[PDB]
Predict the structure.
Amino acid sequence: SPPLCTLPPGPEPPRFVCYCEGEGFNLYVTDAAELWSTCFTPDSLAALKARFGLDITPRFRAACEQQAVALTLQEDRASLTLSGGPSALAFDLSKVPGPEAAPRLRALTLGLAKRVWSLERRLAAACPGESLINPGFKSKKPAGGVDFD
Amino acid sequence: SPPLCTLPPGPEPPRFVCYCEGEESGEGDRGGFNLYVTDAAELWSTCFTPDSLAALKARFGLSAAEDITPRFRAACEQQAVALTLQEDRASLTLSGGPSALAFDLSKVPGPEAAPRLRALTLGLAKRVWSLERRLAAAEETCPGESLINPGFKSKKPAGGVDFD
Amino acid sequence: PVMEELEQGLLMQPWAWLQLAENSLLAKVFITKQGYALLVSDLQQVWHEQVDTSVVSQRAKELNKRLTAPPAAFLCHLDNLLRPLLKDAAHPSEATFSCDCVADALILRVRSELSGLPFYWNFHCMLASPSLVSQHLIRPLMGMSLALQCQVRELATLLHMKDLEIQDYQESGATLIRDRLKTEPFEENSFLEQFMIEKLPEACSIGDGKPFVMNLQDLYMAVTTQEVQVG
């Protein structure tokens, strides 16, 4: 159950959708046309964890369920604020190239469709040739001699 | 929650998704019935016209006022959808109803399909969120025998004197 | 071609029960923007009608004057009025129905309120031709009977296999625990003899045709579709 959230989630149609995957895990936020990813790396991830004293996945899921995620966009930069723990955590993202992202949107759409189908289904129910005389010896055809073609 | 289904059926990863739009209920804006089917890379739409709608309805023994959405939803539930892809055309066969239905689809222009794809993605995300919230909320949160004394007939209540 | 599509649609449609002021009928209606086709019966006679846009417009103008509607809109409204009644009965209709059996013809009058205003229509159904009557009632019924006989034979074979399995269980050194759950051997002749004298009198009563529509419509539709596909 990969956590995800939408903004706005109220009666107004959502504009942006945020999620996480592959815990090179990077938070992906998309407007269905453009994307923003953290592009985390093991060294950068370790440095961030040390700075914040650190898994973020449980906190991210708790915020998404409680809709405690704050978005900000400015040109190609995006800022996320996550709340629910002792101290809110801030993350930055840059506009990932479109050519590299197109497979990402395709995979996200396919996974969303699969999840929709699965969750709807779940909610609905709620030795020829062996010689007979000598076993173990293959039967042998009688000698036909010379049969001209 | 417009009816939709993904193909091919089974545990294999999805490779095609089809859904229907139009015929909105109520007195508000109403659009003609249409089918949108995408592989997440290319989109096909019916591009129907009122004459086309009438011809399609009459071809399969369906009345003009008949609604096709219930049949589409029932077929999607039964996973009775088959697809045949040509170079630039697609044929969809539906067997969810008593009589098989055939639909023809053509590739949507890319410039017009891209906004359609974005809207479809946003709608799918919204439906995923709504259904996940709903699931989280719902899944967890002898005649004339006295009954008192068998073997003795139930005596009638004492009435007394009842003048005729 | 439009008439051909109307005929095919009428053939595809299943029978429905209609409750008039006093009597009852079995009806099949197929309405398209080009006209409509109707077939009514009462288990004694069959009447059929088929009209095109021009006839529909003329009849609408002559019956309910002061109404200026194209034939397509009138046909759509007629469908909206009729289809809910045929699909289900004993529900809010507000659409009076009456029948007049004139010499060698039938007139079915339907009255309704269209957005709070009168809306009248009349079906002038003449006696149905033997070919159409046969194709719509006789051959499908024979096919349904043959299919049901095949189903009965299959169920009898399944019962025989189950009896053989029970015999094997009994002969394999077994001892039934619950004596009440003891099914006697199944004999086709004995079962038929019991049925024909116990349940046939009550199971063969068509009445007004309600059981036919309530029970044997899916089989009827399947048989009609198979016949259409064959030819």
